[PDB]
C-alpha cells in the first residue's frame, strides 16, 4: 500500500462505519506542519458527536489494523494513529480532556487480547489538540477544526507537558531514545510556543547543551532513524535529569 491509499483507506472505514455520527476527519502532527518524509506518522483526529459502542470500536481496530505498519516490519507503510473525540464533551473545557477511542500500534499486543479501548482521560491529547488546532488538514467534514473545539488555554498545555515529563523521568528503562527526543521536543514548545519533529528538535536542544549531554542526545538521534545503539553503558539517567531540570525552569 502506498502512503495515499493508506490515508484513503482510512477515510473511507471511518466514514463507512461511522456513517452519521462523523463530524469531521482532520490529519495533524509531523506531516501536515512539516512534509511528508518516508519516515512520518500519519496522524488523524477525528471528531463525533456520540459516543460509539463498543461493537464500532472493535471494527476500526479490525479495519484499521491491516493498513497500518507493524512495529519492526521492514515494509514501507507508515504508522497510522488515529484518536476521537465527541465534541460536546471538550466543552466546558477542561484538563485533562476525554478521549472516545484510540488506535495506536503501541496497544496491538493489548488489542490482541482483546483490549478495547474505553473512554478514558488523556492529559497528552491537550497538546495534540493544540497541535491540531493551530495546523491540521481537513480531509472530511463541514467545518474546520477549530470551529469544533473551545479555545485551549496554554496554560493547560503548559500543565500537560509537564505532568508527562514527570512520568517520563521515571519510565525511560528501555524507551531511551523516545524519552530523551520527547524531553527536547517538551523544552522546545514551552519557550518558543511551536511543536516540532523530535529528530529535529534533537539537534536543536544538543546544540544549546553541555558537551556530555550533547553526545547521548545526538546518539538518540540516530536511533530514531534505524540505527541500533545499545545504550546498555550510556549514562542516560543524566542527561534525562539535565533535559528535565532545564525544563522544570520553563
Not at 32 to 50: M, Q
Not at 174 to 199: A, F, H, Q, V, Y
Request: hydrophobic share 35%; net charge negative; charged share 25%.
Amino acid at each position: 500500500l502506498n502512503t495515499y491509499e493508506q490515508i484513503n483507506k482510512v477515510k473511507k472505514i471511518l466514514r463507512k462505519h461511522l456513517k452519521n455520527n462523523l463530524i469531521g476527519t482532520y490529519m495533524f502532527g509531523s506531516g501536515v506542519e512539516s512534509g511528508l518524509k518516508p519516515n512520518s506518522d500519519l496522524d488523524f483526529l477525528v471528531v463525533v458527536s456520540e459516543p460509539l459502542t463498543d461493537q464500532s470500536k472493535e471494527i476500526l481496530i479490525q479495519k484499521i489494523r491491516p493498513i497500518s505498519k507493524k512495529i519492526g516490519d521492514k515494509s514501507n507503510l507508515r504508522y497510522i494513529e488515529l484518536t476521537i473525540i465527541i465534541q460536546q464533551e471538550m466543552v466546558p473545557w477542561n484538563h485533562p480532556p476525554k478521549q472516545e477511542f484510540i488506535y495506536g500500534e503501541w496497544l496491538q499486543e493489548l488489542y490482541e487480547q482483546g483490549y478495547i479501548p474505553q473512554k478514558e482521560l488523556n492529559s497528552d491529547l491537550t497538546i495534540m489538540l493544540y497541535q491540531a488546532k493551530r495546523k491540521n488538514k481537513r480531509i472530511y467534514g463541514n467545518y474546520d477544526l477549530e470551529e469544533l473545539l473551545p479555545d485551549i488555554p496554554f496554560s493547560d498545555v503548559r500543565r500537560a507537558i509537564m505532568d508527562s515529563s514527570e512520568e517520563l523521568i521515571d519510565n525511560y528503562q528501555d524507551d531511551e531514545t523516545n524519552s530523551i527526543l520527547t524531553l527536547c521536543r517538551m523544552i522546545l514548545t514551552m519557550d518558543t510556543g511551536k511543536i516540532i519533529p523530535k529528530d529535529i528538535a534533537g539537534n536543536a536542544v544538543a546544540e544549546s547543551s553541555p558537551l556530555e549531554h550533547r553526545e547521548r542526545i545526538l546518539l538518540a538521534v540516530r536511533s530514531y532513524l534505524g540505527e541500533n545503539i545499545e545504550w546498555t553503558n550510556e549514562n542516560v539517567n543524566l542527561t534525562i535529569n539535565y533535559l528535565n531540570n532545564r525544563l522544570k525552569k520553563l
